[PDB]
Write a protein that binds this DNA or RNA. Sequence first.
DNA 1: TTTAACTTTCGGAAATCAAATACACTAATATTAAAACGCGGGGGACAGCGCGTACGTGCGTTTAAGCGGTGCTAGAGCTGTCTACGACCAATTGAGCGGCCTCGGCACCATGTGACTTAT
Length: 97
Amino acid sequence: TPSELALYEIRKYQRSTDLLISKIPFARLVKEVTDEFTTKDQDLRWQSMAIMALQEASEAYLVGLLEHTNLLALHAKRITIMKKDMQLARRIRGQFI
DNA sequence: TTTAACTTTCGGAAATCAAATACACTAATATTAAAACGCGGGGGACAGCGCGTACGTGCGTTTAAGCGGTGCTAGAGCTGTCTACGACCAATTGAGCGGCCTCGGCACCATGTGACTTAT
């Protein structure tokens, strides 16, 4: 059952209490973002714990925006989200757009 | 062995008491700018639909993610020690606007001497 399996999947990671992005990717991503933001001479270290908190804030915001963008698609009487759709959802939420 | 709560005080705060404005509202008033009744309307937003479509839906072979050792070192956090730097006091100013004065210049009465005159 495609719908049954995928909806069950929503519910199980919906009630899962934990972060879910790939980790070594996320860590190297923040590392290179700091490296490019930082310059020639001053370089910055990262422990486990900062990377932690960064991750949780990113997860929480993107999931919140995710229900909102899903909802703007629902308001379009559809179930795909698009560029314009979410672009807007976020931008209506205001920050960073 | 180090983070508290006894205390032992005290001198600015936070009450009080008071009257000095002064402002809010509770309110007459004719006007009069906008309200709100009242019928079409365009216009549009939704019913219904074909078929193109686009993101899932479904398999194969990859790829990275995740461990799992292997350092090693860059800072963490901590400096034990010397000031500097700023928080206080005050003096060390000052300028601005009232205060006295004090300049000189008027109007007015005093004082002496040169005529002259006269009775010495």
